[PDB]
Design a protein around this ligand. Structure first.
Ligand SMILES: O=P(O)(O)O[C@H]1[C@H](O)[C@@H](OP(=O)(O)O)[C@H](OP(=O)(O)O)[C@@H](OP(=O)(O)O)[C@H]1O
Length: 117
C-alpha cells in the first residue's frame, strides 16, 4: 500500500506538444503506482494536486533519449489500455535526463516484478 502510495521523483521539465511543436513548462510527479501527473505550476497545497494537467500510466513503457530538436530530450512511449501514448520531454542536462529516465524505469520494474509473481 504505502510504498505503493509514494513519490519516486518530482520536478520540472519541458513538455513538447504532440502537434504544435513547442516546449511547455510542467511540474511532474512520478508515482510508485505508475501514474505520471503533470501541472501548470508546482502544486501548492494538497488541494491543488487535485486538478492536474496531464495524467498517464508509465508501467509498461519505453524510455528513449534523443538529441533533436534539443539535446537532453527524451521520449516516453507507454501502453494506455489498448493504445500507446508517446510523450516528448526536455531537461537541461543529460544527467538530469538520465535520472528521470532511470527513475521511470525503476517504477516500471517494480510493477513488472509484481506482475511476474
Ligand atoms: O498542444 P498540442 O500539440 O495540439 O497537443 C496536445 C498537447 O501535447 C497536450 O499536452 P499539454 O496538455 O501538456 O499541453 C496533450 O495533453 P496530454 O499529454 O496530457 O494527453 C494533448 O493530448 P490529448 O488531450 O490527450 O489529445 C495533445 O493533443
Amino acid at each position: 500500500s504505502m510504498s505503493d502510495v509514494a513519490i519516486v521523483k518530482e520536478g520540472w521539465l519541458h513538455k513538447r506538444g504532440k502537434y504544435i511543436k513547442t516546449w511547455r513548462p510542467r511540474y511532474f510527479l512520478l508515482k510508485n503506482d505508475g501514474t505520471f501527473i503533470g501541472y501548470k505550476e508546482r502544486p501548492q497545497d494538497v488541494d491543488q494536486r487535485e486538478a492536474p494537467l496531464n495524467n498517464f500510466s508509465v508501467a509498461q513503457c519505453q524510455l528513449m533519449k534523443t538529441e533533436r530538436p534539443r539535446p537532453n530530450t527524451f521520449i516516453i512511449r507507454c501502453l494506455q489500455w489498448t493504445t500507446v501514448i508517446e510523450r516528448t520531454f526536455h531537461v537541461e542536462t543529460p544527467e538530469e535526463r538520465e535520472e528521470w529516465t532511470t527513475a521511470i524505469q525503476t517504477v516500471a520494474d517494480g510493477l513488472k516484478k509484481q506482475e511476474e509473481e
